[PDB]
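Complex record, two chains
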Amino acid sequence: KEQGFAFPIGEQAMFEYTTALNTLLAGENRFRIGDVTTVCWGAKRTPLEESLASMINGGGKDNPDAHIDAVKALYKSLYNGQYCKPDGEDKFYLLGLSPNSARIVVRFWHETTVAAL
DNA sequence: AGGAGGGCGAGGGCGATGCCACCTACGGCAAGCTGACCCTGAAGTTCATCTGC
């Protein structure tokens, strides 16, 4: 299949995830779990139950990198000492990539909640 | 000769066997270095080589 047809990802989809890593490895999403630079972003948030969406205008928007802090400040909690036993159900994608030499080793992949992390 | 050789019951009673404090002071528990070399890449082309012409 020779180098990318081994994994037939469309141009419109290859571009999307490549520039998705590019921004999260250049955004606030990037944070090293330990020696393993990781991009965490919130999954598709629930429909933002009506009452809470009543106050929110628009209403609520799924900003992808919104509550990444919940997971960023979970691993940061190991050094902050500010660990709180979290109740999740807000699932945070956590792609814990790391360099091989010039490939990217996915060391973590967690669609799980910050409680499961 | 035939003797009798103690019988009795006591042999502690009373309390005290410690009092007082002290059982540490001081400071140091590290210094200094290293914590790794080396490579292993994608991607592409070249270049040497092979097959077929």
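Note: Residues 3, 100-103 of chain A lie near DNA strand B (CB under 10 Å from a C1').
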